[PDB]
């Protein structure tokens, strides 16, 4: 890394490894939908756990314990939102 590297970058672009950012980040979403492919379900909790930055979320989305806590509060909403989803019911 930038520790033992002779030539250092001029511009500090943190948005370099975008493929990695969405990579582990996607883990946040799939971790929720791990019980179902409910885009409205995991999308609900994902927004809650979306408080952790792209990379800062990686360490969380990879730890079961770290998820349970964060996904905990969001979980309770999981049922309510997935059950009382009277908003996703488009009328004619």
Swiss-Prot record:
Residue span of region Interaction with SUP35: 6-92
Coiled-coil ranges from the UniProt annotation: none
Domain named PABC: residues: 6-83
Compartments where found: Cytoplasm; Nucleus
Notes concerning its domains: RNA recognition motifs (RRMs) 1 and 2 bind specifically to the poly(A) tail, whereas RRMs 3 and 4 bind non-specifically to polypyrimidine RNAs and may serve to bind to a different part of the messenger or to other RNAs. RRM 2 also mediates interaction with eIF-4G.
Family membership noted in the UniProt record: Belongs to the polyadenylate-binding protein type-1 family.
Job description of the protein: Binds the poly(A) tail of mRNA. Appears to be an important mediator of the multiple roles of the poly(A) tail in mRNA biogenesis, stability and translation. In the nucleus, interacts with the nuclear cleavage factor IA (CFIA), which is required for both mRNA cleavage and polyadenylation. Is also required for efficient mRNA export to the cytoplasm. Acts in concert with a poly(A)-specific nuclease (PAN) to affect poly(A) tail shortening, which may occur concomitantly with either nucleocytoplasmic mRNA transport or translational initiation.
Additional observations: Present with 198000 molecules/cell in log phase SD medium.
Self-association and partners: Binds to poly(A) mRNA to form a periodic structure with a packing density of one molecule per 25 adenylate residues. Interacts with the nuclear export factor CRM1 and with the importin SXM1. Interacts with RNA15, a component of the cleavage factor IA (CFIA) complex. Interacts with translation initiation factor eIF4G (TIF4631 or TIF4632) and release factor eRF3 (SUP35). Interacts with the PAB-dependent poly(A)-nuclease (PAN) complex regulatory subunit PAN3. Interacts with ARF1, DCP1, PBP1, the Hsp70 chaperone SSA1, and TPA1. Interacts with PAT1 in an RNA-dependent manner.
Name the UniProt record assigns to this protein: Polyadenylate-binding protein, cytoplasmic and nuclear
Native organism taxonomy: Eukaryota, Fungi, Dikarya, Ascomycota, Saccharomycotina
Gene: PAB1
């Amino acid at each position: 890394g930038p520790l033992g590297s002779p030539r250092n970058a001029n511009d500090n672009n943190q948005f370099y490894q975008q493929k990695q950012r969405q990579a582990l980040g996607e883990q946040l979403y799939k971790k929720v939908s791990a019980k179902t492919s409910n885009e409205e379900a995991a999308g609900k909790i994902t927004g809650m756990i979306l408080d952790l930055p792209p990379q800062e979320v990686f360490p969380l989305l990879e730890s079961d314990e770290l998820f349970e806590q964060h996904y905990k509060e969001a979980s309770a909403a999981y049922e309510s939102f997935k059950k009382e989803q009277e908003q996703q019911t488009e009328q004619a």
